[PDB]
Amino acid sequence: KTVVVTTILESPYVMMKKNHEMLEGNERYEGYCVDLAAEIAKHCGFKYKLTIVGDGKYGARDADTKIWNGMVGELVYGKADIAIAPLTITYVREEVIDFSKPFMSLGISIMIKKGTPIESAEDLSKQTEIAYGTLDSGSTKEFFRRSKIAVFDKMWTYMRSAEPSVFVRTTAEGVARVRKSKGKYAYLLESTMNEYIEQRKPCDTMKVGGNLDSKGYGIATPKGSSLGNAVNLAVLKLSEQGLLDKLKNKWWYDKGECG
Amino acid sequence: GANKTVVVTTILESPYVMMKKNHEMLEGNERYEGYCVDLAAEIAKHCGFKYKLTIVGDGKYGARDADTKIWNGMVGELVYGKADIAIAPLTITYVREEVIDFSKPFMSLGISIMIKKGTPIESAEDLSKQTEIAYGTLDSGSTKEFFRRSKIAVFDKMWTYMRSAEPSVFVRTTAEGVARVRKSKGKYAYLLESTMNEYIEQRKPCDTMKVGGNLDSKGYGIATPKGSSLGNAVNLAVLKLSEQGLLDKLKNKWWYDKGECGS
Ligand SMILES: CCN1CNS(=O)(=O)c2ncccc21
Ligand SMILES: CCN1CNS(=O)(=O)c2ncccc21
Ligand SMILES: N[C@@H](CCC(=O)O)C(=O)O
Ligand SMILES: N[C@@H](CCC(=O)O)C(=O)O
């Protein structure tokens, strides 16, 4: 029957089409992950229904209740059959759900308003005039929380107690905060999203420094799902045919507005 | 039953696995050093097994004979039950995933171009549009298969040339490709993984360089026979080492910290 796909509104991965209010079902949406879902479904031979994750989150486990939220929770608790989204492969998630081989590479990166005197994470950690933070309920925040790497641990110690909160509910809110804070806020986000925004009007942000880590997004399934093997082979087939590169070029470079 | 020493297949490929100085008087795992030797030790510690490193007999990564359908190389060692795990720069591919299991990648790479410094080549398109400079790949690996299978015009054109070139543009080992670049006065370019390319660019006599972008994007994984009980633990260990920053430290250790071409 119809495979329930959980995904998340995150540009350019999944976006509402122009005039979506008169559209229905999968046709409401467009983007990299919408295209990828169609390709994966064709290769594996299933029909599917795109559903936007109810709580709008990627997935974290509450320290006390030990309940998972976000897309990870939807998989864990049986609300969706598969997640096709910019969902980061991590140790803690691999303990509770399955991931395909990665379909896209990324690392944590720094976004600044152009002209901000920051070149690195070390720079951020050694000052206090420029505030910085991350997305809530995602892998970037969990990276800093868990990290024993000295610069990142120092950064976490500042971020977790900063007032007002330096954490944001959505990627778009982080970007807006960079753009509105006259250089006094820098946002820690994945290189994929940073690079997309850097090529969008008003062309006032940039990625500075190297990436802080190296990882990937995978297609996720509940542990022991029958779909896992076919989905993994489909990712590798699309990779080897060059279609993942084509999709990246379509939704990043072609979406470029800054010349 | 009782714990058994895990047989690890690997390959003599610098800087992943190399003969130590004084290897002639050393035994067992102590004979070897490198990135994958260090990685093996970390994986074994995390998963709680003892192991024996064994260099693959035929010195190949792994390809399936089109006629006999027999796998050679490290892939073959796993398929036919001669090794329990491969800890090596073994590329994750579709055809290999059909017959063995891979961890999540522990290193990223892409196919790339190695030239002798000063060679007037900047891209694969450049190579494809001329005949003065020969070019080829390693035998029995994923780079050769990439060109054989590609439907992208430039890479297909490159394959049509390479497959029929005389004398043969293919090499049996990475070292042979490097020698051919170094000795051919700019008239041979070598197609190899970016990891290997970047390593050699930091070795004396500092006469090669990587040019252009990478032609694809993939990774190396730790491989096990299909359905092996080791796979889950090994995968979690790769991800833990990744998150801890240790894979990045190992890359720096073996590529750059003792690079020979300056700071
Ligand atoms: C080698 C670090 N790494 C860690 N393993 S991973 O999260 O599957 C991943 N995916 C894509 C690129 C790199 C990568
Ligand atoms: C996203 C392309 N890709 C394809 N899947 S892969 O071979 O597991 C891989 N590993 C590391 C980095 C990239 C990568
Ligand atoms: N890709 C992340 C969300 C973005 C972020 O945390 O920066 C995740 O899967 O949690
Ligand atoms: N890593 C490759 C070998 C090197 C190459 O083909 O360039 C493999 O696993 O086949």
In angstroms, rounded to a whole number, what is the distance separating the alpha carbons of residues A115 and A182? 10
Indicate where chain A has its CATH 3.40.190.10 domain(s): 1-106+216-255, 107-215
CATH of domain B110-218: 3.40.190.10
Question: How far apart are alpha carbons A94 and B52 in whole angstroms?
Answer: 28
Contacts with A17 (C-beta within 8 Å, 6 or more apart), sequence order: A23, A27, A28, A29, A30
Nearest beta carbon to residue A105 from set B93, B217, B242? B217
The closest of A155, A152, A198 to A175, measured between CA atoms, is A198
Alpha-carbon torsion, ordered A77, A82, A85, A89, to 10 deg:
70
In chain A, DSSP assigns E strands to 3-7, 15-16, 29-30, 48-52, 82-83, 97-99, 104-106, 108-113, 131-133, 185-190, 205-208, 215-217, 220-222
**Domain ranges in chain B with CATH number 3.40.190.10:** 1-109+219-258, 110-218
Quickly list DSSP for A35-96. HHHHHHHHHHT--EEEEE-TT-----B-TTT--B-HHHHHHHTTS-SEE-SSPBP-HHHHTT
* Surface-to-core class of residue B246, CB atoms within 10 Å of its CB (0-12 exposed, 13-18 middle, 19+ buried): middle
CA distances from B211 to B18, B141, B215 (A): 26, 21, 11
B138 in Cβ contact with B170 (< 8 Å): yes
A93 alpha carbon, closest ligand: 3
Residue A21 Cα to ligand 1 middle (Å): 38
Place of tokens 């309940």: A67
Resolution in A: 1.6
A·B CB contacts under 8 A: 66
CA distance B13 to B173: 8
From residue B158, give the alpha-carbon distance in Å to each of A14, B124, B175: 37, 8, 22
d(CA B177, CA B80): 29
Beta-bridge mates of residue B71? B64
The secondary structure of residue A102, as a DSSP letter, is P
The DSSP code for A129 is S
Q: B225 phi and psi, to 5 degrees?
A: -65, 150
Side-chain-side CA neighbours of B224 within 13 Å: the count stands at 13
CA-to-CA distance for A207 and A189, rounded, in angstroms?
A: 10
Closest CA to A79 of A66, A90, A70: A70
Query: Per the structure block, which two tokens stand in for A96?
Result: 């509770």
Give the type of residue at A40.
I
Q: How far apart are CA B7 and CA B74, in angstroms?
A: 12
Helix, strand counts (H, E) of chain B: 10, 13
CB A34 within 8 A of CB A14: yes
Q: Which residue has the tokens 């509105």?
A: A180
B211: how many CB neighbours lie within 10 A of its CB?
A: 19
The DSSP symbol for B145 reads: H
Measured from the alpha carbon of residue B235, the closest ligand is 1
Euclidean distance between CA atoms A209 and A122, whole angstroms? 10
Q: Does B227 contact A at CB distance below 8 Å?
A: no
Using CA atoms, how far residue B252 sits from A208, A249, B199, B256, in Å, is 21, 30, 10, 5
Using alpha carbons only, what angle is made at residue A210 by residues A207 and A216, rounded to the nearest 5 degrees?
90
B142 is in an annotated binding site: yes
The residue whose CB lies within 8 Å of the most ligand 3 atoms, and thus the one to mutate among A87, A144, A207, is A87
> What is the rounded CA–CA span in Å between residue A240 and residue A227?
20
Q: How far is CA A227 from CA A232, B102, B165, B224, in A?
A: 9, 17, 43, 21
Q: Is A146 exposed, middle or buried (0-12, 13-18, 19+ CB in 10 A)?
A: middle
My answer on whether omega of the bond before A86 falls inside 30° of 0, hence cis, is no
Tell me the C-alpha distance between B5 and B3, whole Å: 7
Kind plus residue range of the DSSP H or E element containing A160: helix A150-161
A107 and A192 Cβ atoms separated by less than 8 Å: no
E strand or H helix that includes residue B10: strand B6-10
Q: Top-level CATH class of A107-215?
A: alpha beta
**Determination technique used:** X-ray
Q: Is B219 on the interface with A (CB under 8 A)?
A: yes
What whole-number distance in Å separates Cα of residue A199 and Cα of residue A194? 9
Residue to mutate (ligand 3; options A13, A58, A134; most atoms within 8 A of CB)? A58
Q: Any idea of the CA torsion for A12, A15, A17, A18, to the nearest 10 degrees?
A: -80
Q: Does residue A91 sit at the B interface (CB-CB below 8 Å)?
A: yes
Cα dihedral B39, B44, B50, B55 sign: negative
* Cβ of A157 less than 6 Å from ligand 2: no
Cβ–Cβ contact B233 with A under 8 A: no
Closest by Cα among B70, B10, B18 to B199: B18
Reading the block at residue A100, the tokens are: 């395909």
DSSP bridge partners of B219: B108
Is residue B146 packed enough to be buried (19+ CB in 10 Å), middle (13-18) or exposed (0-12)? buried
The CATH code for residues B1-109+219-258 is: 3.40.190.10
β-pairing, A48-52 vs B51-55, is unpaired
Angle between helices B153-164 and B142-149 (to 10 degrees): 110
Ligand 4 pocket: which residues have CB below 6 Å?
B 61, 89-91, 138, 141-143, 192-193
Domain boundaries A1-106+216-255, corresponding CATH code? 3.40.190.10
Q: Do B242 and A215 count as a contact with CB atoms less than 8 A apart?
A: yes
Q: Touching check for A211 and chain B: CB below 8 Å?
A: no
Q: How far is Cα A185 from Cα A168, in angstroms, rounded to an integer?
A: 12
